[PDB]
């Protein structure tokens, strides 16, 4: 099938960070929202990877910012969890949802905290990520973050509540 | 005039079970360095259906690394709670109803659950989450598994063919 052909195309392009490649697989008629074996779409698979401007031309071309992988994960967890920054900022610009639970209730300021990513620990908290989630275990980022031995992330949730 | 022998049913029986799982576990605990030498998993799948774990396996802990190796160093166990614990998740994973996806993720689990236990020096729990995942295939899950083709139609689906 063709265009179920050109999503698998575009999927890949988005993974491996193929900027042009992505741009032109969107002009053939890629389906911008084209998801793969694990519900993951071409925004999730950029946004994991560190792909910024392919990132950008997903969300200018109707990506949905808050889709959902086979394990609840949203584009704004996987930025989230792997540390990039400029990703998490232009996610929330665009709708993502702060507060979104992946598999176990994990939230993005569940991820960040336990990763160590204080800038985006920061973020999140300006875009109103809930400082007093508790996933499955009962755990807030804060307990996350203590975990982990991140006290000045510790340190900034402590004064957010 | 070999006669054969009409066997009343033995209900703990589950060879084909016991196997996918003993070689998916032993698989993984020597990927992740908890397990060395002889013994189910070590060396190439001796069976289409475990090479179809095996791949299926890899392949999902590559696009969720740390999901379940969380979930399980954050999961407070002892040998005491351990059954308790592998349940919870497990009845957590199958909300929403059973899928092959779902499968492979339990079987992930199941892995993760025991790396974890070998690393906290419960090395004993290992034998025991494999049983515990067994009885949870055969009694919990084995209509859909048969209702959706079996085992067979498993390693169709992720196996790596007939030439291979």
């Known amino acids: 099938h063709h265009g179920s052909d050109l999503g698998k195309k575009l999927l890949e392009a988005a993974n491996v960070g193929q900027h042009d490649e992505v741009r032109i697989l969107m002009a053939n008629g890629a389906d911008v929202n084209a998801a793969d074996k694990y519900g993951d779409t071409p925004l999730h698979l950029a946004a994991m990877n560190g792909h910024l401007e392919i990132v950008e031309v997903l969300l200018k071309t109707g990506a949905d910012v808050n889709a959902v992988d086979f394990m609840g994960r949203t584009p704004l967890h996987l930025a989230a969890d792997n540390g990039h920054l400029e990703i998490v900022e232009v996610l929330l610009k665009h709708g993502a949802d702060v507060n979104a639970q992946a598999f176990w209730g994990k939230t993005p300021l569940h991820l960040a905290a336990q990763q160590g990513h204080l800038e985006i620990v920061e973020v999140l908290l300006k875009h109103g990520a809930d400082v007093n989630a508790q996933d499955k275990f009962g755990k807030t980022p804060f307990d996350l973050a203590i975990d982990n031995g991140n006290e000045d992330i510790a340190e900034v949730l402590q004064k957010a509540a | ?164």
């Open chain 2, 1 to 164: 005039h070999h006669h054969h022998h009409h066997g009343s049913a033995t209900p703990a029986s589950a060879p084909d079970t016991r196997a996918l799982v003993a070689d998916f576990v032993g698989y993984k605990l020597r990927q992740k360095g908890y397990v060395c030498g002889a013994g189910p998993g070590e060396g190439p799948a001796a069976d289409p259906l475990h090479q179809a774990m095996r791949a299926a396996g890899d392949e999902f802990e590559t696009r969720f690394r740390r999901t379940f190796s969380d979930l399980a160093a954050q999961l407070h166990v002892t040998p005491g709670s351990a059954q308790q614990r592998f349940t919870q998740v497990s009845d957590e994973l199958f909300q929403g109803g059973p899928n092959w996806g779902r499968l492979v993720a339990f079987f992930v689990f199941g892995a993760a659950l025991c790396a974890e236990s070998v690393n906290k020096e419960m090395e004993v729990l290992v034998g025991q989450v494999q049983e515990w995942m067994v009885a949870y295939l055969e009694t919990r899950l084995a209509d859909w598994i048969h209702s959706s083709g079996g085992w067979a139609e498993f390693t169709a689906l992720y196996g790596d063919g007939a030439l291979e």
